[PDB]
Each structure stands twice: as structure tokens, then as C-alpha cells.
């Protein structure tokens, strides 16, 4: 009941196959199962057929006509600059992060471990000083209750 509609100008992300995780624009609808996709500004991504089970619709949409030329599509993309807006989305960031880890060189993997350990160390220290006052953890709450047993 809440979904991004399939229409001319809607941006989609490919799920599987050779063009996995690429972004294209729907330029035409043939039937209930297939569409035509093109991305002028990216390598590969010429006009081709795609099954509707292999795409995911995004929030962004361009204002073009059905079966528009690759030129008019190009200016429409440039004017709206939706490609830049999609790149700044959280979901796009996660996909790029997953790729960078797959192409790491095992020395940057060590660097990532050092950075994650440094952040965890500082979080533990900050949490501890904020727990000495205003007890939150189980041991500080229990200690306060036990210190209340001071009638001896």
C-alpha cells in the first residue's frame, strides 16, 4: 500500500546478474514482467531488457516521456542531478562499503581493526565515567543498594 511505483523515469537498482548493484532509469514498459533500462552516464548500461523480479525501485524519479532518446534522458539526469543525490543516501554508502572491504589488501584490514579497537576503548572509558555518577549498570545499581545497608 506504500511503494515506489514503476513508471517511465523511475530510478531502479539491479539485484543480480552481470549488472548487480548498478543504477539505471526505466525508459519503457513492455508487459507485466519486463521493462527497458538505460543509464547514459555510466559504463555499460545501454538500453536493454530487464525482468521486473530483478530490480528494486528507488525514491528518485525523473520527468521524461516513454521511449525517450538517450540525449533527452541525458539532459534530464544532469538538470535534476539525482545520481548525486542517490550517492549520498545511506543505502548507497553501505553498498560501497561492502565493496571496499571485498577489495582490501589485508594491511588496510589491520588498519580497520586498529580503528575499531580504538573506538571501542574510548567508548568503554566514557561509559565508565558517566556510570560512576548516575548509576546505570547492574554492578553500580547493586553497589548503591548494598551501601544502603549501612546500619552496622
Amino acid at each position: 500500500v506504500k511503494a515506489n511505483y514503476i513508471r517511465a523515469g523511475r530510478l531502479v537498482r539491479i539485484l543480480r546478474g552481470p549488472r548487480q548493484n548498478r543504477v539505471g532509469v526505466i525508459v519503457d514498459i513492455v508487459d507485466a514482467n519486463r521493462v527497458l533500462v538505460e543509464n547514459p552516464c555510466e559504463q555499460k548500461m545501454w538500453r536493454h531488457v530487464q525482468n521486473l523480479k530483478n530490480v528494486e525501485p528507488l525514491k528518485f524519479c525523473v520527468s521524461i516521456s516513454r521511449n525517450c532518446s538517450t540525449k533527452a534522458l541525458k539532459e534530464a539526469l544532469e538538470s535534476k542531478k539525482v545520481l548525486e543525490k542517490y550517492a549520498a543516501t545511506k543505502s548507497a554508502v553501505r553498498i560501497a562499503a561492502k565493496k571496499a572491504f571485498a577489495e582490501s589488501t589485508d594491511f588496510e584490514r589491520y588498519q580497520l581493526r586498529v580503528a575499531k579497537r580504538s573506538r571501542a576503548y574510548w567508548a568503554r572509558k566514557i561509559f565508565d565515567d558517566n556510570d560512576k555518577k548516575n548509576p546505570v549498570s547492574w554492578h553500580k545499581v547493586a553497589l548503591k543498594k548494598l551501601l544502603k545497608n549501612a546500619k552496622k
Partner: protein, 221 residues
């Protein structure tokens, strides 16, 4: 399964306190009965220890009357000479699931009998498994991935109630108490969860800047 005195003396001599083997706990709510059993049977044969809970929420395709008639036809089969030797018709949902899994195993060999002994089935979530860790699901046997929305299905608990199961009300009362108890505790322990999230955000401002740049590049912070 209750330890004898011999086990108690041996553990005391060697200073052993507690031990928990590797066990996977599966929440079977809104899972297809046949597809869940087939996946569980293969994993048992590969040497896994599996405990399933909420067996009364398993689903079978078709109307309730169709599945009720199917069970009654099974109940009619018995050894005429001596029914106490004939096939046994268990009525609880957990017993129905165990029978289904047993039919997908080499049950007449020691290897098959050992695999069946590694499975424990429950109705609801008993008190001894509540605090054991996070439960898992099987995406290839989930209802929203298997049935078309317009078809009619049957909940196993409702089917068993009308063919002989006598503890449907008992299980319902126990489940209501567990949701209340767990919900209260999860509403508690939110101040600690918020405090931990705030500490991580307070970090990246005291930690070294070079390590912060690395985290940004890998999309972690």
C-alpha cells in the same frame, strides 16, 4: 538425564561447575510444516543440535476442515487384532512435528535414532530457554515467502485442539505471562542501551583523528 551421585562426585573432584553444548534455537512461528521439517532433518544428519519452540504456530496450506479430515483418516488406521501394538496417533503440536521429522530420517538404523535424539520440541517458549540467547528463523520456509496471499491456511494449534489436544488453554495462558514479563524487562534496560549508544557517539571526538578517517572510508562512522 538427572545427574547421579557418581557424576556429582566426579565434577566436584575436578572442579567443574557448568557446561552448555552448542545448540541452535529455532522459532517456528509462521513456518511451513513440510519445508521446515525437511531442512531440519538434513541439518540433524550433519550433526547439529536443534531445539524448536512455538510449535503450535506452524502452518499448513489449505482450509482447516480439509486438514482436520486428513488427520481423522490417519486416526482410523489401527491394528485390528491388538490396537495397543498399532500405530500411535499423537495429538500435541510438538509430537506432530517430531513424527513428521522422523518420517524424513533413516529411523531403523542407529545413525537415524541418534539424529532424532538430538531434537527437542516445545509449545511456546519455556522458562529454561528464554535466557539462552537469540532465536533464529528459516527464510526458505517462512509463510510470507511460500504462500500466495489469497490462499487459506491452517494453524497447527487450532487443528490439534479439535482432534484431542487438551492443553491449548494452558499454553495460551503461559504465553500471555511470558510476553508481559519479557516486555517489562525490555522496557527496563533501555537506559543502559541508550547510554551505550551515546558513548559511541561521544567517541569519534576523543579518539585519534587518523582512525576516524579510516572508519569513514569503510562506512562505519
Amino acid at each position: 538425564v538427572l545427574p547421579s551421585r557418581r557424576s556429582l562426585n566426579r565434577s566436584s573432584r575436578k572442579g567443574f561447575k557448568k557446561h552448555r553444548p552448542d545448540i541452535i534455537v529455532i522459532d517456528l512461528k509462521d513456518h511451513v510444516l513440510g519445508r521446515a521439517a525437511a531442512i531440519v532433518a538434513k541439518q540433524l544428519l550433519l550433526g547439529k543440535k536443534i531445539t524448536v519452540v512455538r510449535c503450535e504456530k506452524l502452518t499448513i496450506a489449505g482450509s482447516e476442515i480439509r486438514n482436520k479430515i486428513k488427520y481423522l483418516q490417519f486416526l482410523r488406521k489401527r491394528k485390528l487384532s491388538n490396537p495397543k501394538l498399532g500405530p500411535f496417533h499423537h495429538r500435541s503440536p510438538s509430537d506432530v512435528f517430531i513424527r513428521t521429522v522422523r518420517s524424513m530420517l533413516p529411523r531403523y538404523t542407529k545413525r537415524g535414532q541418534r539424529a532424532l535424539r538430538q531434537l527437542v520440541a516445545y509449545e511456546g517458549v519455556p522458562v529454561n530457554v528464554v535466557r539462552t540467547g537469540g532465536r533464529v528463523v528459516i527464510p526458505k520456509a517462512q509463510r510470507h515467502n511460500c504462500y500466495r496471499n489469497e490462499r487459506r491456511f491452517t494453524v497447527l494449534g487450532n487443528m490439534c485442539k479439535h482432534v484431542g489436544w487438551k492443553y491449548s488453554d494452558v499454553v495460551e495462558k503461559l504465553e500471555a505471562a511470558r510476553i508481559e514479563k519479557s516486555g517489562r524487562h525490555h522496557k527496563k534496560m533501555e537506559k543502559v542501551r541508550v547510554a551505550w549508544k551515546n558513548a559511541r557517539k561521544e567517541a569519534l571526538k576523543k579518539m585519534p583523528q587518523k582512525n576516524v578517517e579510516v572508519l569513514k572510508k569503510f562506512g562505519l562512522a
